[PDB]
């Protein structure tokens, strides 16, 4: 294969250099997923012309001399949930009721609008939990995106899809969305690099409620290297007066690659001292930390302070995110998809617990979240009010088996206690609450599985969770364990 485990900078010098066109990265790219793809369910949309369409037009334009972008030819693939793009499906993580519905004229997602804009390549849409509302990709009309580490086993959610085929070689970016973790938790699952950018820092268009009680929500990229991570943050961040919350900040994320990390000082905790965590994820975690006290940063433990168990805490981000689901389900109910009456197959009782729990939730009851949110995001503040990056282990836990019954769901127990199998296990769900830039470093292989290091930076420093991820990445290489998809029987 001419593109199979290439990075997006390979490519976009084999592309402008007039190595290969832009037609043979699209033709090399779709022989891969329908080669590999099978085993790991990862796609649920192909757009095949239309990538071939654009591949003909972005050819023309390069032998021609025109202008091209800056990702000219990288091929890439969106996430199915929330998704817009005109003509595109949409069905909020695998709703069979939505199968039929298409992209209305002019109303895009960011992440297709602005990759497409520098001339990268989409193919299609990958795999979703329905509402993203678990930290598994699993639902019962697509079914379980597998991970390439292990096909038993899941890719992690809610971006599984995203992360799988970047994971598995087939694609050198993906898109990604984060409510309560979803760029990061697969990608640490998976052994891939996942960016979750300051709040602002990426547009994100929420209609008709821009102004809704949910987390902080994020676009972001997936990737095998930091540096490609760069180059899509260079075209996803930007301002846009539509997002409430834009930055109107230009930055060049490839300047930090080469910054390293002398000097820093590093706070490190293994549980952010209220999440039940797998002793071998925090052992490995201890050891990872070691790496930038080798690279002339200092490290040392530190307790956030979070006066909430973190059952509080879940059960506040879940009524968080339901409030929102809950205007979606009495939208779609209006114009004619019932997914409380006549589709109410559709949707995972787990996640129908949480709805009605909402459907008329006390302002008493919003307030007491809010609370709960302010106390964690000051918690967070205390931390780079001394230290420049915080450590933490991405999940309490490693790779759950996929089930059969289209509900994979995480542990409900860990170390012997309770947790929330949607979403408890994943603490990235802080950095939602906080708004913090952060990033999931692969740290390395816990019985042939991925375990993933989070690295969160200071409000808007994501230049800084970017350059300690690079030197990480030099340090301590997690490309070599990439040997394991890339030998998978097919
Ligand atoms: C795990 C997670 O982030 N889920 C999730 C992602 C996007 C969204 O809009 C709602 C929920």
């Not at 990958?126 to 079914?143: A, E, K, L, M, Q």
Request: net charge negative; charged share 20%; hydrophobic share 40%.
């Amino acid at each position: 294969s001419p593109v199979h485990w290439k990075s997006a900078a390979e490519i976009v010098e084999l592309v402008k250099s007039k190595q290969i066109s832009p037609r043979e990265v699209v033709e090399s790219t779709i022989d891969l997923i329908e080669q590999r793809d099978p085993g790991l369910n990862a796609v649920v949309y192909k757009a095949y012309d239309e990538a071939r369409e654009k591949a003909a037009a972005l050819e023309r334009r390069i032998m021609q001399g025109e202008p091209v972008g800056m990702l000219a030819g990288v091929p890439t693939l969106m996430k199915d949930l929330f998704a817009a793009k005109p003509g595109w499906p949409s069905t909020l993580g695998g709703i069979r009721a939505l199968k039929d519905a298409r992209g209305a004229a002019g109303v895009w997602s960011t992440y297709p609008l602005k990759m497409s804009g520098e001339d990268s390549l989409l193919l299609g849409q990958t795999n979703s939990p329905v509402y993203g509302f678990r930290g598994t990709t699993d639902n019962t009309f697509f079914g379980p995106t597998r991970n390439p580490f292990n096909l038993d086993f899941n890719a992690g959610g809610s971006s599984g899809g995203a992360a799988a085929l970047v994971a598995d070689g087939i694609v050198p970016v993906a898109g990604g969305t984060d409510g309560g973790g979803a760029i990061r938790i697969p990608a640490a699952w998976t052994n891939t690099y996942g960016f979750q950018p300051s709040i602002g820092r990426v547009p994100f268009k929420s209609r008709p409620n821009a102004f809704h009680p949910g987390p902080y929500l994020y676009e972001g990229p997936i990737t095998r290297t930091v540096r490609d991570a760069a180059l899509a943050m260079n075209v996803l961040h930007g301002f846009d007066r539509r997002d409430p919350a834009s930055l109107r900040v230009k930055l060049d994320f490839t300047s930090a690659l080469a910054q390293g990390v002398r000097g820093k000082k590093i706070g490190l905790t293994l549980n952010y001292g209220v999440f039940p965590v797998q002793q071998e994820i925090q052992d490995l975690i201890g050891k990872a930390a070691r790496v930038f006290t080798e690279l002339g940063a200092h490290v040392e433990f530190v307790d956030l302070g979070i006066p909430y168990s973190q059952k509080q805490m879940s059960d506040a981000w879940c009524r968080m995110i339901a409030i929102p689901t809950v205007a979606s389900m009495q939208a779609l109910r209006k114009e004619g998809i019932d997914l409380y009456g006549e589709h109410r197959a559709d949707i995972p009782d787990a996640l129908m617990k949480w709805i009605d729990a909402v459907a008329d939730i006390s302002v008493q009851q919003i307030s007491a979240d809010q609370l709960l949110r302010t106390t964690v995001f000051d918690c967070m503040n205390g931390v780079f009010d001394r230290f420049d990056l915080l450590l933490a282990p991405t999940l309490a836990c490693m790779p759950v088996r996929n089930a059969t019954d289209g509900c994979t769901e995480g542990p409900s127990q860990i170390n012997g206690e309770e947790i929330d199998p949607l979403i408890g296990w994943c603490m990235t769900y802080l950095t939602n609450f906080s708004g913090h830039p952060s990033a999931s470093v692969p740290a390395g292989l816990i019985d042939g599985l991925p375990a993933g290091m989070l690295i969160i930076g200071d409000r808007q420093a994501d230049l800084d969770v970017i350059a300690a991820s690079a030197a990480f990445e030099r340090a301590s290489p997690w490309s070599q364990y990439y040997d394991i998809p890339a030998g998978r029987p097919l």
